[PDB]
């Protein structure tokens, strides 16, 4: 079974750059959902797969990968933020973001230029091609979580759906990813990048 | 030119039921940027066709869609609601609603359920299939337009993306579900069918 | 597991609608590929499952769409051919058939123009819409199975992937689909009718 | 308006890696009717256009789009192939091809599983992102062109539509690959490189 997993600080702790409400309707409402429905989901495919039903499989197909990404993208999400984030990486991935797109900069432009650009729900990555062995951004609609549909490992995610700026930000898309920079969590980026640098 | 029509009613009126502020800002903010860049998408368009370039014209293809359906759908909501609306349709549309639904109750849930059920950001609608010559249930994503998309004709569309009931409604978007059947103008859906019924 | 199916008469008794060696191709080498890899993508699907690994569940549905979709296209396809085939159907069917389409013929032209109209390749399917109790006209992509991804019940389908009639009919699809008219098992369609008019 | 273009070569002339039968219909037949069907598409976008039709203009989306990649990719195409062609590229086209893809054979490999790998119509293609500036393999559903849908800029395309390679190869589409590579036309595909690197 999988679980809601617990956020690494409380609801405020994002204050004033995503507040205290998103973050406990985000995590509190719109998370706990997606495992909940991910565990029926999974239980269903489990008895078509034991059946040798293949229509039922396809039939369960999108509400698979729209929760099932909705855990994992979630899952990512909470991790890659931090009230003590924001700031610059360093080392490795700095070295790699300069590489690969220029300047830090450059590649804050180039995923949120990718991240306001997804028409509809969707998320923004920074991503690892483990083929290519660079970094590459990418943008991806509703819940198809990055690994799953891409191939590429998932570095960093921001979650462009409207629940995630709406009562904040309202419509402007562009003034919620200009304050996401404060609490990136460097740390778990350069971690997972790291874990990854094969 | 396009232009952003006038609202048929004070941004207030819809009220309890879909608050000022959303409507505000659904009207004033979300509909005016559609018809801005669907102004600007319709100029480049016309630089592609003369020039004969196919290129430009298929690349340009996602941003008419998406500001072309954003103006028609949005255009075509604001007619179906109404502050002296809600209730049930009367004459013919309701009897072909019990014809092809069984009742208005089941409409009701029919279409509730599509709404529901659209994973990410998009529309429930209501239409009629001039083939087939009989009312029909359909769910189109982002602002993918019903008739463009589908061939259907649009008689009652609900806005089931996040920036149309989250203030409101939060994550429960049966509750504004619930609420919209209150400012439902059956004056207009049954004007639609009208139009249509040949 | 699943296997393929032996087909119930040989590779040339459908001529001279469809030669025996697009029969013995299309049955041996790619109904058969289909389930080969159908089988494979089903043993790792349950592997990722036991796993509860999410990402690798994700990663092989498109696999097991468009081969498990393959195996029952295919599995339908074969059933709905036969030597003895041709001509129109009887009662029910043909009664359901004059009341949703008009008549014989104009049901003809709409499986028709369904078929020769999908772009690159799919199927046309002839289905059965449980919910609203009529027949209903459907063309899916590659191989999407007609239920498992529109909830339709497959009742007659007709491949129009290349490899279906390209080595008699070249690039001439119309011709395609008038000489299979011929061969159609109705007796099977009709089957398939009243085992949903239930 | 938009032309077929005349080979720069005799059907026959990619011997016997292509056969002529495949080459002529190809030509005369397919391309033919996507430019065709692309002038009458492009005629009807101009008329919805002209009267702000914005439902008109969506609606004609699909066939412009699979008619008009088709005349382009089908343009490349030809020029891609040569009866002097075969073996590897030269200078700057060769070094990019080893710094990208670890070697000219490596590269061959990727190429190649990529089209093979299409599932139902489709092209496989070498492309250059510019914004990188780095060459990179993609691969396009039905007629989809690289550029349009990708930003890539096309160097290479290898149809894997069936039409392209079944009459002689039948299923066996590794085969076609495997002769394909007889007659590329890497002084076409260099000249295209050339151009963008600019
Ligand atoms: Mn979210
Ligand atoms: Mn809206
Ligand atoms: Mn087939
Ligand atoms: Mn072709």
Request: aromatic share 8%; charged share 10%; glycine share 8%.
């Given at each position: 079974k999988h679980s809601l997993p617990d956020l690494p600080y409380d609801y405020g702790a994002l204050?004033?750059?995503?507040?205290?409400?998103?973050?406990?309707?985000?995590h509190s409402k719109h998370h706990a959902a997606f495992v909940n429905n991910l565990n029926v989901t999974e239980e269903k495919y489990q008895?078509?797969?034991?059946?040798?039903?293949?229509?039922?499989?396809?039939?369960?197909?999108?509400?698979?990968?729209?929760?099932?990404?909705?855990?994992?993208?979630?899952?990512?999400?909470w991790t890659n933020l931090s009230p003590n984030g924001g700031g610059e990486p360093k080392g490795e991935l700095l070295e790699a973001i300069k590489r690969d797109f220029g300047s830090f900069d450059k590649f804050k432009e180039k995923l949120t230029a990718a991240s306001v650009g997804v028409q509809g729900s969707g998320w923004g990555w920074l991503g690892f091609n483990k083929e290519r062995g660079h970094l590459q951004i990418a943008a991806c609609p509703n819940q198809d979580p990055l690994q799953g549909?891409?191939?590429?490992?998932?570095?960093l995610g921001?979650?462009?759906?409207?629940?995630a700026?709406?009562?904040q930000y309202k419509n402007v898309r562009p003034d919620y990813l200009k304050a996401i920079w404060?609490?990136?969590?460097w740390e778990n980026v350069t971690e997972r990048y790291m874990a990854c640098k094969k």
């Open positions: 204050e004033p750059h995503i507040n205290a409400q998103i973050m406990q309707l985000h008895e078509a797969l034991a059946k040798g039903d293949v229509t039922a499989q396809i039939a369960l197909q999108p509400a698979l990968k729209f929760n099932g990404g909705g855990h994992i993208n979630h899952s990512i999400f549909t891409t191939g590429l490992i998932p570095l921001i979650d462009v759906w409207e629940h700026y709406y009562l404060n609490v990136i969590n």
